[PDB]
Amino acid sequence: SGFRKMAFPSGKVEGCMVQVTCGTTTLNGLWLDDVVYCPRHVICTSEDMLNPNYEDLLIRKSNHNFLVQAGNVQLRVIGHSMQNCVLKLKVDTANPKTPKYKFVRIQPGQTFSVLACYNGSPSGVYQCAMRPNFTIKGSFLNGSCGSVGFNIDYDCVSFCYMHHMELPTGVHAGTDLEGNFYGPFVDRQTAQAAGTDTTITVNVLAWLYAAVINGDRWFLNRFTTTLNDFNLVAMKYNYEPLTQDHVDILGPLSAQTGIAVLDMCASLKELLQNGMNGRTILGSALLEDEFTPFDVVRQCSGVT
Amino acid sequence: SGFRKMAFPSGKVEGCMVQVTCGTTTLNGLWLDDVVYCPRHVICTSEDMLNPNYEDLLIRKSNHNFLVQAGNVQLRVIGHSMQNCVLKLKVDTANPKTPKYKFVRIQPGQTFSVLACYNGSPSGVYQCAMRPNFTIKGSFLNGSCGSVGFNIDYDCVSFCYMHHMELPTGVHAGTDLEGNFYGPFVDRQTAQAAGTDTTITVNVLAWLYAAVINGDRWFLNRFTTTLNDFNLVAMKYNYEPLTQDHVDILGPLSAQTGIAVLDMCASLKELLQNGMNGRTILGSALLEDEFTPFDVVRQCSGVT
Ligand SMILES: C[C@@]1(C(=O)Nc2nncn2C2CC2)CCOc2ccccc21
Numbered sequence: 011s012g013f014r015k016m017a018f019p020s021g022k023v024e025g026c027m028v029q030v031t032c033g034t035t036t037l038n039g040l041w042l043d044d045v046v047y048c049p050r051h052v053i054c055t056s057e058d059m060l061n062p063n064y065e066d067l068l069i070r071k072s073n074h075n076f077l078v079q080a081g082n083v084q085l086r087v088i089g090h091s092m093q094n095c096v097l098k099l100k101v102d103t104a105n106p107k108t109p110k111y112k113f114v115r116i117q118p119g120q121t122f123s124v125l126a127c128y129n130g131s132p133s134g135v136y137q138c139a140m141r142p143n144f145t146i147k148g149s150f151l152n153g154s155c156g157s158v159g160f161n162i163d164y165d166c167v168s169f170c171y172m173h174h175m176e177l178p179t180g181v182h183a184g185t186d187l188e189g190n191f192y193g194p195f196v197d198r199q200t201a202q203a204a205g206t207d208t209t210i211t212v213n214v215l216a217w218l219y220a221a222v223i224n225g226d227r228w229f230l231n232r233f234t235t236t237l238n239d240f241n242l243v244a245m246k247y248n249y250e251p252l253t254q255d256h257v258d259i260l261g262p263l264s265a266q267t268g269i270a271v272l273d274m275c276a277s278l279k280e281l282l283q284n285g286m287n288g289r290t291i292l293g294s295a296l297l298e299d300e301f302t303p304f305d306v307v308r309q310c311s312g313v314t
Numbered sequence: 315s316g317f318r319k320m321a322f323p324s325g326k327v328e329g330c331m332v333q334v335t336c337g338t339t340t341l342n343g344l345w346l347d348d349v350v351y352c353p354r355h356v357i358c359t360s361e362d363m364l365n366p367n368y369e370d371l372l373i374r375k376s377n378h379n380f381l382v383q384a385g386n387v388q389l390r391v392i393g394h395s396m397q398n399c400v401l402k403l404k405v406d407t408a409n410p411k412t413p414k415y416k417f418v419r420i421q422p423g424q425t426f427s428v429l430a431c432y433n434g435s436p437s438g439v440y441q442c443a444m445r446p447n448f449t450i451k452g453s454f455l456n457g458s459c460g461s462v463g464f465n466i467d468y469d470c471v472s473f474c475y476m477h478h479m480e481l482p483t484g485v486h487a488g489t490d491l492e493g494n495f496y497g498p499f500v501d502r503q504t505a506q507a508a509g510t511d512t513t514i515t516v517n518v519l520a521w522l523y524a525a526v527i528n529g530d531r532w533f534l535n536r537f538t539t540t541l542n543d544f545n546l547v548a549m550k551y552n553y554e555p556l557t558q559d560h561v562d563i564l565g566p567l568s569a570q571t572g573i574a575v576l577d578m579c580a581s582l583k584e585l586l587q588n589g590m591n592g593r594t595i596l597g598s599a600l601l602e603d604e605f606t607p608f609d610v611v612r613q614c615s616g617v618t
């Protein structure tokens with residue numbers, strides 16, 4: 011037992027991190043097969059970021075201007091193209107460590123692991139969620155752009171995120187591996203404010219189920235509620251509305267614990283209305299929303 | 315910017331995980347050079363755990379009774395010995411993926427990453443701290459024994475922990491890689507209760523410095539305190555006493571932020587006495603103590 015904010019093992023993704031340099035700018039690239047993926051802002055100076063015309067800035071770049079280094083060995087760049095906000099650099103060598111992989115675009119509320127990198131080298135791994143306002147709250151310093159977010163299904167790495175930007179509020183923005191930004195964000199040094207960061211209700215309920223499985227039961231009460239009644243409270247507390255799809259997804263956790271989904275909603279409702287009163291749930295003093303119901307099942311069963 | 319509970323990249327340790335089976339019991343082993351390290355309780359039945367005589371149980375075991383599998387390939391066991399609470403299985407093949415490594419015994423308050431494993435396969439990675447009562451609060455199910463805790467200094471993995479046990483309270487106990495338990499715990503299914511789980515004061519102060527660096531400054535006040543005055547409050551709140559050694563260790567964070575160590579102690583004192591009042595610091599509603607001052611510097615500078 012015990013329940014932790016766990017990230018996927020990062021080895022398969024570490025084998026893909028390379029360093030990409032264009033002019034004075036160095037960031038991270040993802041090397042899969044004979045292609046290196048990186049944020050297109052690698053071609054910009056700090057001055058260009060205010061109002062970059064990426065197509066025009068890219069005409070001045072040739073294959074030899076993109077320096078790609080995998081560990082301490084240089085990769086030969088034989089092609090380059092821009093797909094949305096990422097550059098795809100064709101190299102003459104397939105990455106020998108390329109794992110089985112997919113490029114997926116996740117939904118808000120979904121979680122993933124980030125392998126934070128600097129100069130193509132991994133610094134650490136942590137678990138994130140795509141917020142309902144399409145930002146992530148990561149740990150990213152200068153040089154961390156090009157670090158990726160991913161999930162793993164046994165031996166297949168599903169890449170879902172590539173880091174590009176830090177908003178003036180300290181939150182993070184990026185793209186899927188096709189270069190499309192999550193949310194309305196653009197790769198330009200301009201006023202971009204995030205919308206309401208609501209709480210991922212289905213994730214909190216999944217985490218309440220993990221708490222019951224792992225022995226933290228104080229918050230369980232004698233009440234029940236309905237989806238409509240719960241959602242009035244959820245609205246008031248800036249929580250995502252709960253749908254019948256969410257109830258269905260929580261079905262296995264409900265079955266394993268014997269606590270009906272709406273009963274757990276009534277427990278959550280009282281926690282919202284009354285607070286924790288100085289108590290904790292799974293070592294946290296706030297309601298955690300960065301575990302999906304699939305993460306809870308995975309961790310509570312021991313999936314590898 | 316942004317600050318996260320970050321674990322080290324696990325690739326180097328994933329390359330060392332093997333499966334060890336003895337009789338009906340399967341757990342994890344750590345393969346470094348031509349030795350596989352695992353908890354000695356691999357030789358026990360569930361019945362043996364009540365009062366095992368490890369030397370006597372081990373006489374009935376031969377090299378061929380320890381089945382070691384690295385991925386899907388069997389390793390030939392050519393020697394076996396017991397060192398304290400671990401077994402060292404000599405195999406005929408050096409692990410080709412053995413990283414540069416050390417075996418270190420950490421102090422309470424120190425943090426490390428755990429690569430939770432099942433049947434020699436990695437399931438996830440998370441950051442831990444050796445609690446002041448010598449327990450860890452991990453996420454460990456049946457079959458996770460033999461999973462290891464570690465730190466990394468560039469390319470050198472310092473192994474500090476091997477998982478062995480779950481106490482009836484849901485907390486975890488284990489050994490360093492020489493097989494010596496942290497704390498007073500023994501590998502026997504018996505009444506073992508942990509002592510006071512105090513808060514690692516120097517870690518909380520380090521995390522308050524990370525919060526100021528990353529923009530969360532509301533808790534900064536107009537006060538100062540002394541070590542002796544701070545420690546009276548720390549005692550009342552079950553916090554570890556702060557020593558001049560801790561003040562010295564926080565020196566670089568104090569320098570970087572311009573906030574004297576004792577001023578931050580006065581901020582911590584008011585947080586203890588007054589609570590958070592429904593506010594958060596780095597997305598947490600409790601004072602976090604699982605970041606050392608070295609972890610804060612590492613993450614805030616981008617060490618790889
Ligand atoms: C490259 C840059 C950026 O945000 N980098 C970044 N990302 N996460 C963290 N950091 C560092 C600031 C800490 C700089 C600001 O202008 C922009 C504008 C758009 C896209 C990127 C960027």
Ligand SMILES: C[C@@]1(C(=O)Nc2nncn2C2CC2)CCOc2ccccc21
Nearest residue numbers: 011363454455456478479480501502503
């Ligand atoms: C093997 C065992 C154990 O605690 N295993 C373990 N460790 N972390 C998690 N789990 C599973 C229980 C979930 C079982 C109980 O008796 C003992 C007694 C001593 C040492 C080990 C053990």
